Design a protein around this nucleic acid. Structure first.
Ligand code: ZN
Ligand code: ZN
Ligand code: ZN
Ligand code: ZN
Lengths: 78, 84
DNA sequence: CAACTAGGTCACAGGTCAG
DNA sequence: CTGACCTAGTGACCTAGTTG
């Protein structure tokens, strides 16, 4: 499976999407606090892949919130 | 390893930056180099300089060319704990 | 109870600012 | 400019916990 967010290999089904450890952790970290990720530099249309997933935080998150990641979409068990 | 040396200048490496084991100077140098319209003067020797700790700041152009020469890329960064 | 994941833990690019 | 010291994260791993 492929992280449905940065094409990096997926560790499991996370927050309602197949994802890699980095985007899972990066997701919980984004919702599990009231952080104000700095505005976007490159006009809010940032690509997100395994090689540049950490460059824009607003865009990696916004992307997370588009492939349908969410806790109300969490799914425990086989 | 206990002590790995900077692949750009042989200084002690403070980690694995931009894709390779670099000292802390090249690290901040590479970053500063790619992070701007920073174009260094040419190299009075047609870029054949060598890099070591003592002369690593003499010819910039050649150091940067050394960084890129070894692999330093924003696309080669390995964040978080070293795997196994 | 096993298959399977949300969270915590903690091993690991960039801003500073003195030299 | 340069780079030793901070700050703010990043994600490999472990396992407490949840389903079916
Ligand atoms: Zn990912
Ligand atoms: Zn962006
Ligand atoms: Zn170095
Ligand atoms: Zn030179």
């Amino acid at each position: 499976l492929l992280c449905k967010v940065c094409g990096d290999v997926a560790s499991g089904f996370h927050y309602g999407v197949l994802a890699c450890e980095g985007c899972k952790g990066f997701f919980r970290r984004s919702i599990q606090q009231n952080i104000q990720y700095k505005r976007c530099l490159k006009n809010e249309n940032c690509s997100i892949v395994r090689i540049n997933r950490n460059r824009c935080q607003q865009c990696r998150f916004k992307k997370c919130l588009s492939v349908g990641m969410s806790r109300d979409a969490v799914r425990f068990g086989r």
